Design a protein around this ligand. Structure first.
Ligand SMILES: Cc1cc2nc3c(=O)[nH]c(=O)nc-3n(C[C@H](O)[C@H](O)[C@H](O)COP(=O)(O)OP(=O)(O)OC[C@H]3O[C@@H](n4cnc5c(N)ncnc54)[C@H](O)[C@@H]3O)c2cc1C
Length: 272
């Protein structure tokens, strides 16, 4: 039999109760929410995400999140969240709306989840189903490798796919991740990524860049660029699928122009 799914209809909002909040570091949290029963699963296909919605200071706010849990987890869903506090970043004095609202929640408070959502679904063994828009059928494409470029919070869509491939010992897809962040301190999910590299190096290639580097730094510094793409994603001759998730200026200025310079078809580079 299969477990009961939580996300039965994508137009329904499901208020889920907050049961645990881990302080991972000063500005990183893991929030665990109970599903409707301990035996439920979320019902989130690999490749897709949920939305959280709430009335925050009187206004509706909706944001996408990819859990760090999977449909293997019974009874809960986990979100890893970067909290963007006010009065930290000079360009963002107000800080972030949903992330500060999550940080404010008390154990036992609920928040609405919806899903699944997203134009890409991973069907296993290299096969991706990608819709051009929501109203259209998917193009099924089967690849031998996947380039992944994440910035900041954009890691969790990548991690979800990486995890799904590595857990299938008969999935020979090779993932190459290039992960950009502001600083070393701001990197999310580093232990988790490095665990995967330790266990699955043949199938999982990991590289970091940081806008500004620490004194002791073994990886790249600067924004994603042509060299990093040549050095840390599969070559275009191999026809990899390229996935991206990061802030709009990163995608627009750093990723697409440089994917094109290397020769990847820019039109086929998918942004979550
Ligand atoms: C498919 C998908 C999955 C995602 N999964 C996750 C996830 O698992 N975890 C997660 O944390 N986010 C995730 N995100 C990002 C998430 O949707 C929100 O963008 C994020 O929570 C910030 O929203 P907010 O309402 O707090 O900030 P907003 O109010 O929307 O602020 C706008 C932007 O301002 C910038 N900003 C604000 N304050 C600061 C600051 N102090 N320093 C640096 N920049 C700042 C950030 O770039 C921010 O996104 C995902 C996004 C996508 C597209």
């Amino acid at each position: 039999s299969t477990p009961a799914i939580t996300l039965e209809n994508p137009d329904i909002k499901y208020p889920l109760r907050l049961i645990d909040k881990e302080v991972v570091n000063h500005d990183t949290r893991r929030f665990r929410f109970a599903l409707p029963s301990p035996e439920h699963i979320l019902g989130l296909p690999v490749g897709q995400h949920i939305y959280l919605s709430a009335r925050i200071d009187g206004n509706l706010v909706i944001r996408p999140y990819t859990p760090v849990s999977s449909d293997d987890d019974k009874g809960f869903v986990d979100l890893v969240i970067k909290v963007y506090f006010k009065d930290t970043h000079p360009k963002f004095p107000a800080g972030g709306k949903m992330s500060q609202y999550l940080e404010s929640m008390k154990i036992g408070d609920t928040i609405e989840f919806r899903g699944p959502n997203g134009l890409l679904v991973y069907q296993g063994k290299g096969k991706f189903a990608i819709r051009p828009d929501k109203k259209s059928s998917p193009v099924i494409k089967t690849v031998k490798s996947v380039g992944m470029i994440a910035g900041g919070t954009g890691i969790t869509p990548m991690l979800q796919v990486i995890r799904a491939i590595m857990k299938d010992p008969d999935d020979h897809t090779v993932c190459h991740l290039l992960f950009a962040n502001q600083t070393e301190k701001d990197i999310l999910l580093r232990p988790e990524l490095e665990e995967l590299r330790n266990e699955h190096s043949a199938r999982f290639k990991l590289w970091y860049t940081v806008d500004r580097a620490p004194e002791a730094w073994d990886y790249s510094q600067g924004f994603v660029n042509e060299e990093m793409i040549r050095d840390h994603l599969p070559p275009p001759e191999e026809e990899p699928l390229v996935l991206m998730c990061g802030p709009p200026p990163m995608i627009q200025y750093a990723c697409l122009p440089n994917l094109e310079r290397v020769g990847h078809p820019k039109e086929r580079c998918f942004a979550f």
